Design an enzyme around this catalytic site. Structure first.
Site, mmCIF file in Angstrom:
data_model
loop_
_atom_site.group_PDB
_atom_site.id
_atom_site.type_symbol
_atom_site.label_atom_id
_atom_site.label_comp_id
_atom_site.label_asym_id
_atom_site.label_seq_id
_atom_site.Cartn_x
_atom_site.Cartn_y
_atom_site.Cartn_z
ATOM 1 N N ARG A 177 0.803 -1.288 0.025
ATOM 2 C CA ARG A 177 0.045 -0.132 0.022
ATOM 3 C C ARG A 177 0.894 1.274 0.152
ATOM 4 O O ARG A 177 0.760 1.931 0.987
ATOM 5 C CB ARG A 177 -1.066 0.121 1.192
ATOM 6 C CG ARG A 177 -2.065 -0.757 1.323
ATOM 7 C CD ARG A 177 -2.688 -0.696 2.749
ATOM 8 N NE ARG A 177 -1.857 -0.577 3.902
ATOM 9 C CZ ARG A 177 -1.987 -0.653 4.981
ATOM 10 N NH1 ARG A 177 -3.297 -0.991 5.481
ATOM 11 N NH2 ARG A 177 -1.052 -0.457 6.142
ATOM 12 N N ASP A 242 -0.165 -9.175 5.555
ATOM 13 C CA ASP A 242 -1.653 -8.513 4.887
ATOM 14 C C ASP A 242 -2.614 -9.832 5.069
ATOM 15 O O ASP A 242 -3.828 -9.630 5.287
ATOM 16 C CB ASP A 242 -1.461 -8.194 3.393
ATOM 17 C CG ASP A 242 -0.928 -6.714 3.629
ATOM 18 O OD1 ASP A 242 -0.974 -6.076 2.383
ATOM 19 O OD2 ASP A 242 -0.538 -6.255 4.699
ATOM 20 N N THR A 243 -2.092 -11.203 4.496
ATOM 21 C CA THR A 243 -3.039 -12.226 4.844
ATOM 22 C C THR A 243 -3.574 -12.312 6.039
ATOM 23 O O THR A 243 -5.079 -12.407 6.325
ATOM 24 C CB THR A 243 -2.157 -13.653 4.440
ATOM 25 O OG1 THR A 243 -1.117 -13.607 5.391
ATOM 26 C CG2 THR A 243 -1.972 -13.573 2.992
ATOM 27 N N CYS A 348 0.741 -22.979 1.599
ATOM 28 C CA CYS A 348 1.420 -22.016 2.461
ATOM 29 C C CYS A 348 1.951 -22.763 3.577
ATOM 30 O O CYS A 348 1.755 -23.626 4.460
ATOM 31 C CB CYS A 348 0.212 -21.572 3.272
ATOM 32 S SG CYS A 348 0.866 -20.177 4.514
ATOM 33 N N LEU A 349 3.298 -22.361 3.853
ATOM 34 C CA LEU A 349 4.430 -22.808 4.942
ATOM 35 C C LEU A 349 3.892 -22.298 6.115
ATOM 36 O O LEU A 349 4.041 -22.837 7.319
ATOM 37 C CB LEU A 349 5.600 -22.657 4.533
ATOM 38 C CG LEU A 349 6.451 -23.599 3.651
ATOM 39 C CD1 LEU A 349 8.011 -23.066 3.741
ATOM 40 C CD2 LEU A 349 6.398 -24.886 4.191
ATOM 41 N N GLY A 350 3.260 -21.105 6.186
ATOM 42 C CA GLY A 350 2.843 -20.434 7.352
ATOM 43 C C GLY A 350 1.517 -20.902 8.001
ATOM 44 O O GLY A 350 0.945 -20.442 9.020
HETATM 45 C C1 HEM Z 1 -4.562 -16.374 6.727
HETATM 46 C C2 HEM Z 1 -3.366 -16.257 6.468
HETATM 47 C C3 HEM Z 1 -2.631 -16.744 5.321
HETATM 48 C C4 HEM Z 1 -3.057 -17.260 4.106
HETATM 49 C C5 HEM Z 1 -4.360 -17.176 3.473
HETATM 50 C C6 HEM Z 1 -1.905 -17.811 3.275
HETATM 51 C C7 HEM Z 1 -1.990 -18.002 1.889
HETATM 52 C C8 HEM Z 1 -0.842 -18.547 1.211
HETATM 53 C C9 HEM Z 1 -0.937 -19.187 -0.066
HETATM 54 C C10 HEM Z 1 -2.210 -19.153 -0.890
HETATM 55 C C11 HEM Z 1 0.294 -19.510 -0.429
HETATM 56 C C12 HEM Z 1 0.428 -20.188 -1.890
HETATM 57 C C13 HEM Z 1 0.992 -19.139 -2.888
HETATM 58 C C14 HEM Z 1 1.093 -19.768 -4.289
HETATM 59 O O1 HEM Z 1 0.922 -21.009 -4.478
HETATM 60 O O2 HEM Z 1 1.530 -18.828 -5.263
HETATM 61 C C15 HEM Z 1 1.059 -19.307 0.661
HETATM 62 C C16 HEM Z 1 2.517 -19.618 0.506
HETATM 63 C C17 HEM Z 1 3.474 -19.106 1.564
HETATM 64 N N1 HEM Z 1 3.043 -18.690 2.709
HETATM 65 FE FE1 HEM Z 1 1.355 -18.271 3.536
HETATM 66 N N2 HEM Z 1 -0.940 -17.768 4.124
HETATM 67 C C18 HEM Z 1 -1.112 -17.119 5.363
HETATM 68 C C19 HEM Z 1 -0.178 -16.998 6.282
HETATM 69 C C20 HEM Z 1 1.242 -17.002 6.428
HETATM 70 C C21 HEM Z 1 1.946 -16.770 7.588
HETATM 71 C C22 HEM Z 1 1.594 -16.394 8.883
HETATM 72 C C23 HEM Z 1 3.205 -16.882 7.185
HETATM 73 C C24 HEM Z 1 4.431 -16.871 7.812
HETATM 74 C C25 HEM Z 1 5.390 -16.416 7.607
HETATM 75 C C26 HEM Z 1 3.158 -17.585 5.619
HETATM 76 C C27 HEM Z 1 4.173 -17.728 4.871
HETATM 77 C C28 HEM Z 1 4.054 -18.457 3.455
HETATM 78 C C29 HEM Z 1 5.412 -18.719 2.745
HETATM 79 C C30 HEM Z 1 6.858 -18.735 3.271
HETATM 80 C C31 HEM Z 1 4.918 -19.358 1.428
HETATM 81 C C32 HEM Z 1 5.381 -19.662 0.137
HETATM 82 C C33 HEM Z 1 5.453 -21.330 0.314
HETATM 83 C C34 HEM Z 1 6.303 -21.699 -1.083
HETATM 84 O O3 HEM Z 1 6.267 -21.164 -2.085
HETATM 85 O O4 HEM Z 1 7.017 -22.890 -0.992
HETATM 86 N N3 HEM Z 1 1.753 -17.345 5.298
HETATM 87 N N4 HEM Z 1 0.566 -18.561 1.530
HETATM 88 C C1 LIG Z 2 -0.625 0.237 -14.863
HETATM 89 N N1 LIG Z 2 -0.453 -0.995 -14.358
HETATM 90 C C2 LIG Z 2 0.018 -2.188 -15.442
HETATM 91 C C3 LIG Z 2 -0.145 -1.204 -12.964
HETATM 92 C C4 LIG Z 2 1.456 -1.126 -12.596
HETATM 93 C C5 LIG Z 2 1.689 -1.401 -11.143
HETATM 94 C C6 LIG Z 2 0.624 -1.837 -10.365
HETATM 95 C C7 LIG Z 2 -0.743 -1.973 -10.606
HETATM 96 C C8 LIG Z 2 -1.975 -2.211 -9.988
HETATM 97 S S1 LIG Z 2 -1.554 -2.816 -8.374
HETATM 98 O O1 LIG Z 2 -0.770 -1.767 -7.728
HETATM 99 O O2 LIG Z 2 -2.734 -2.995 -7.778
HETATM 100 N N2 LIG Z 2 -0.578 -4.130 -8.285
HETATM 101 C C9 LIG Z 2 -0.412 -4.837 -6.965
HETATM 102 C C10 LIG Z 2 0.933 -4.842 -6.610
HETATM 103 C C11 LIG Z 2 1.502 -6.361 -6.354
HETATM 104 C C12 LIG Z 2 1.430 -6.714 -4.962
HETATM 105 C C13 LIG Z 2 2.918 -7.791 -4.800
HETATM 106 C C14 LIG Z 2 2.581 -8.741 -3.642
HETATM 107 C C15 LIG Z 2 3.324 -8.420 -2.277
HETATM 108 C C16 LIG Z 2 2.959 -9.288 -1.161
HETATM 109 N N3 LIG Z 2 3.572 -10.567 -1.498
HETATM 110 C C17 LIG Z 2 4.033 -11.641 -1.137
HETATM 111 O O3 LIG Z 2 5.305 -12.117 -1.392
HETATM 112 C C18 LIG Z 2 3.174 -12.205 -0.046
HETATM 113 C C19 LIG Z 2 2.417 -13.299 -0.399
HETATM 114 C C20 LIG Z 2 1.892 -14.068 0.834
HETATM 115 C C21 LIG Z 2 0.933 -15.178 0.055
HETATM 116 C C22 LIG Z 2 1.510 -16.297 -0.663
HETATM 117 C C23 LIG Z 2 1.902 -15.488 -1.704
HETATM 118 C C24 LIG Z 2 0.462 -14.723 -2.530
HETATM 119 C C25 LIG Z 2 -0.066 -13.755 -1.442
HETATM 120 C C26 LIG Z 2 -0.321 -14.639 -0.252
HETATM 121 C C27 LIG Z 2 0.911 -12.485 -1.070
HETATM 122 C C28 LIG Z 2 2.980 -14.383 -1.350
HETATM 123 C C29 LIG Z 2 -2.887 -2.846 -10.521
HETATM 124 C C30 LIG Z 2 -3.251 -2.582 -11.749
HETATM 125 C C31 LIG Z 2 -2.339 -2.032 -12.745
HETATM 126 C C32 LIG Z 2 -1.013 -1.822 -12.125
#
Ligand code: HEM
Ligand SMILES: CN(C)c1cccc2c(S(=O)(=O)NCCCCCCCCNC(=O)C[C@]34C[C@H]5C[C@H](C[C@H](C5)C3)C4)cccc12
Ligand SMILES: [K+]
Length: 404
Positions: A177, A242-243, A348-350
């Site tokens: 954000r 954020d999750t 998810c590992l968390g």
């Molecule tokens: C409501 C809470 C949470 C939700 C819904 C959530 C959801 C997810 C999801 C959907 C993925 C898979 C993403 C993918 O396949 O691309 C993921 C991966 C992961 N999460 Fe969470 N998560 C949560 C909390 C947490 C917490 C508390 C941690 C601790 C740090 C964590 C750490 C991780 C890590 C390290 C991975 C990557 C696993 C890998 O790529 O092998 N998560 N999570």
């Molecule tokens: C004009 N244009 C092309 C644009 C340019 C730039 C932005 C734009 C946006 S936008 O601003 O809305 N784009 C969103 C930014 C991406 C967010 C990055 C994720 C960070 C959390 N990361 C993790 O790794 C945790 C985690 C933790 C778990 C597992 C896994 C997936 C989730 C849940 C997140 C990893 C919207 C529309 C257009 C855009």
């Protein structure tokens, strides 16, 4: 801006769903996404929003694509593509088989035995936060409990001093954000500048903490690099913020608006772990995706190498083919089916830490502040993205009904 339709995509599959601003957002974000599961909507659609990408709309296709990493790669896991491309955290952007060693390492710092050990410290933190709100008779839950909670758990896990919270919170906020002070890469680098020195020191003098473990780790029979440890430590930090914040907010919003569901948990606190699972289904909130490694026909549909596909974890448990009356919350469902924590090699590992955060929160809140409501007049607003959530959650209670 719609993106012009690629020639391989037939018109009849086009449904311009915008994941960052869905049509029915005002009705609730999960509801807004559930329009994709209306009977006129195919199991696999193309939207021209956000650069153009496929969306799998049913739990069966979502699960299948997540299992098949050979066709559906995590190299580019985010829509839009530019985000997916700049994203380098480990293991989230790696495919098997390389991802496997990094995942095992990360599992050492957040896996079940670590969670069992931390449970009481988690309860202490929750209790301390709740007890400071309790006499006020009001809070913004998202701001006053949800945001401070998981970042403090990360500090305990990572053996970092509480003094560092404000700066750390700021940098992670900028990634998800941004206020404009810093680009993603600047926030990323500042994070790295923060972790790099602690990594080097804990390499030299190990602790029993997450940063030490990830730093002294071995992957592919060799020592983890500094680039690899910081990129892992990065994910461990942001992955559970954020999750957890947004999920806790959906849950509290539901309980505030549903006295009968609150009362159930008050009267039968033993059902709280089951309630957690059913909430995780109903208020699922992640939608990431994959990129096609090659041309591939999937369920009658021609996918082209390099196409992105959104595979919303959120949708599987809301699919009425997976759970009957999916919008209904029932804490006694015999079979709670969902992919809220993902599916396949990146599951998810968390997840065990998240479930303990959720259960401890609900148990501690409901015993101290059993009776609360949405603030008179407030209309709760949701936001949609890769992690959907709750803008703000103003809650009210009568302090005389609370227990110190
Ligand atoms: C409501 C809470 C949470 C939700 C819904 C959530 C959801 C997810 C999801 C959907 C993925 C898979 C993403 C993918 O396949 O691309 C993921 C991966 C992961 N999460 Fe969470 N998560 C949560 C909390 C947490 C917490 C508390 C941690 C601790 C740090 C964590 C750490 C991780 C890590 C390290 C991975 C990557 C696993 C890998 O790529 O092998 N998560 N999570
Ligand atoms: C004009 N244009 C092309 C644009 C340019 C730039 C932005 C734009 C946006 S936008 O601003 O809305 N784009 C969103 C930014 C991406 C967010 C990055 C994720 C960070 C959390 N990361 C993790 O790794 C945790 C985690 C933790 C778990 C597992 C896994 C997936 C989730 C849940 C997140 C990893 C919207 C529309 C257009 C855009
Ligand atoms: K990438």
């Amino acid at each position: 801006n719609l993106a012009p339709l690629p020639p391989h995509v037939p018109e009849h599959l086009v449904f311009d769903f915008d994941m960052y601003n869905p049509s029915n957002l005002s009705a609730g974000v999960q509801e807004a996404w559930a329009v994709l599961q209306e009977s006129n909507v195919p199991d696999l659609v193309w939207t021209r929003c956000n650069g153009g990408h496929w969306i799998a709309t049913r739990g069966q296709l979502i699960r299948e694509a997540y299992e098949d990493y050979r066709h559906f790669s995590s190299e580019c896991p985010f829509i839009p593509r530019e985000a997916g491309e700049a994203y380098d955290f480990i293991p989230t952007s790696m495919d098997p088989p390389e991802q496997r060693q990094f995942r095992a390492l990360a599992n050492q710092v957040v896996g079940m035995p670590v969670v069992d050990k931390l449970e009481n410290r988690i309860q202490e933190l929750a209790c301390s936060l709740i007890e400071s709100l309790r006499p006020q008779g009001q809070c913004n839950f998202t701001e006053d409990y949800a945001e401070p909670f998981p970042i403090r758990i990360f500090m305990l896990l990572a053996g970092l001093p509480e003094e560092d919270i404000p700066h750390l919170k700021y940098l992670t906020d900028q990634m998800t954000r941004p206020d404009g002070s810093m680009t993603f890469a600047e926030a990323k680098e500042a994070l790295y500048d923060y972790l790099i020195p602690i990594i080097e020191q804990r390499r030299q003098k190990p602790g029993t903490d997450a940063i030490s473990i990830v730093a002294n780790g071995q992957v592919n029979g060799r020592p983890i690099t500094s680039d690899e440890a910081k990129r892992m430590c990065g994910l461990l930090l942001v992955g559970g913020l954020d999750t957890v914040v947004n999920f806790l907010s959906f849950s509290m919003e539901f309980l505030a608006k549903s006295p009968e569901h609150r009362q159930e948990l008050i009267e039968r606190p033993e059902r709280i772990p089951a309630a957690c699972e059913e909430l995780l289904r109903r208020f699922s909130l992640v939608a990431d995706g994959r990129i096609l490694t090659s041309d591939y026909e999937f369920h009658g549909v021609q996918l082209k190498k390099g196409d992105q596909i959104l595979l919303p974890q959120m949708l599987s448990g809301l699919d009425e083919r997976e759970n009957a009356a999916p919008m209904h919350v029932d804490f006694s469902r015999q079979k709670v089916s969902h992919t809220t924590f993902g599916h396949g090699s990146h599951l998810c590992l968390g997840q065990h830490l998240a479930r303990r955060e959720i259960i401890v929160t609900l148990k501690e809140w409901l015993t101290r502040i059993p009776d609360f409501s949405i603030a008179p007049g407030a209309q709760i607003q949701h936001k949609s993205g890769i992690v959907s959530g709750v803008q703000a959650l103003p809650l009210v209670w009568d302090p005389a009904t609370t227990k110190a």
